[model samples]
Target: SVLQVLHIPDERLRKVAKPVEEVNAEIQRIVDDMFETMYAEEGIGLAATQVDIHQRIIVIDVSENRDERLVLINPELLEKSGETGIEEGCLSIPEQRALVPRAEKVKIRALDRDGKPFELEADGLLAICIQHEMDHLVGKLFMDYLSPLKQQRIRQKVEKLDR
Candidate 1:
């Protein structure tokens, strides 16, 4: 169930996701499909908003062999410190990368795939991935960190490849 990943300017990408009150069987199915979609696209991180689902859930696995999969639902950042800049890209907005500044360390609390609440501390790529995907839940993209001219330039680059 590889869902279509929405692109920039798709309008749906701007949607603010609704918080999941509960993670039921239906929610599990969507999370499953999300992993399939993310793995299929070779994306290390994915937000439900990227799939136009408009739900607060994100899947991530920065591992090389893809064995360390993680799921976070209705996540909220509890703490963040230190500045780190990384060249980042998005699955929805392909063929572009921008150096976005992010907190090198972060603490977050969220419901797991099983709906159990948990808190975790992270750094490096994991921290960046969590920050990046969380932004999608609130209708923000990495491109938003760049200059307007650069954003518009990228918009047209990917736009021309659209069918």
Candidate 2:
């Protein structure tokens, strides 16, 4: 079953995830749970931190139709192409959006739930999604790229939501 999500402004969401040791049943189960949570939240992608797991794992299903989606585990961005801008939001951050600059295309290497290696080149929204999630693995948030004023503004908005 999918697990609970770490809401935005939660300190855990900012924690960096560690590399997954191996793809085993345990890891696979986490993937399933992540998929469930993502669908439950109507999100296209999720990182381990969102589920309070500090492992370098993420799942994404960016298909126009959610059913035709992909689950990624311990993903690594091998290459990128061009540049693009997307107004992105995070499940952790709730009702916040930012025009985050990212590569227009990306090549990723990741292991499937079955421990098989896979690689793919993604562009457009898919590309941004990959970069976004990958950033989470390294303890980054969209606000980090924005100016201090913008970051403070987002913190204020989030802080307001907390009250």
Candidate 3:
């Protein structure tokens, strides 16, 4: 089943996810639901953190036609290469966007939905989305990239989602 996403300003968004100990049948089902939820929310990526699942799993579709899909489970960044670009929006933080500096290219190794390990090298849209989603696993949000004053105010200014 598709699930409700935890929006920004929610303390759950700041909770760091635990690494999946086993990619069993349950994990597969969760990724499937995540993809559906992300599509419904017009998001290119959705982390387990976004759903308040608190697991290191992320689903992303950065295709030009929005038809491609990638799942990263227990992801570890092998390297972050290329230039630094500033910008991105998040499904969690819907209203205001941030000028978060993100890497242009990224290489990482992660387990697939089936517990299989694989390496991926991404650029452009995929890279940014990957970084953004991965940040969720570490309890980092785009809104946290803004100034301290703005950061403190944002939590008070915006109401929590699905609270």
For model 2, the run of ten residues with the poorest summed lDDT: 63-72
Clash-forming residue pairs, model 3? none
- Model 3: how far residue 7 lies from native, Å: 1.8
Task: Show how many residue pairs clash in every candidate, following the order shown.
Answer: 0, 1, 0
TM-score for candidate 3, please give it.
Answer: 0.90
Best by lDDT: 1
- Candidate 3 per-residue C-alpha lDDT over 60-135 given as tens digits, one digit per residue, 9 for 90 to 100: 9976687888999999999997776556778877665667778899999999988999999988878888899999
Q: In model 3, what is the error at residue 87, expressed in angstroms?
A: 2.9
Q: Global lDDT of each model?
A: 0.94, 0.84, 0.86
lDDT of 1 by residue, 1-163 (tens): 9999998779899999999989999999999999999999999999999998989999999999999889999999999999997999999888889999899999999998999999999999999999999999999999999999999998998898785
> What's the lDDT for candidate 1?
0.94
Report residue 22 deviation for candidate 1 (angstroms). 0.6
Question: Per-residue lDDT for 33 in model 3?
Answer: 97
Question: Mind sharing the TM-score for model 1?
Answer: 0.98
Provide the lDDT at 69 for model 3: 83
For residue 26, model 1's alpha carbon misses the true position, in angstroms, by 0.5
Instruction: Report the Cα lDDT for residue 152, model 2.
Output: 82
Candidate 1: regions farther than 4 A off: none
Q: Which stretches of candidate 3 lie over 4 Å from their true place?
A: 160-163
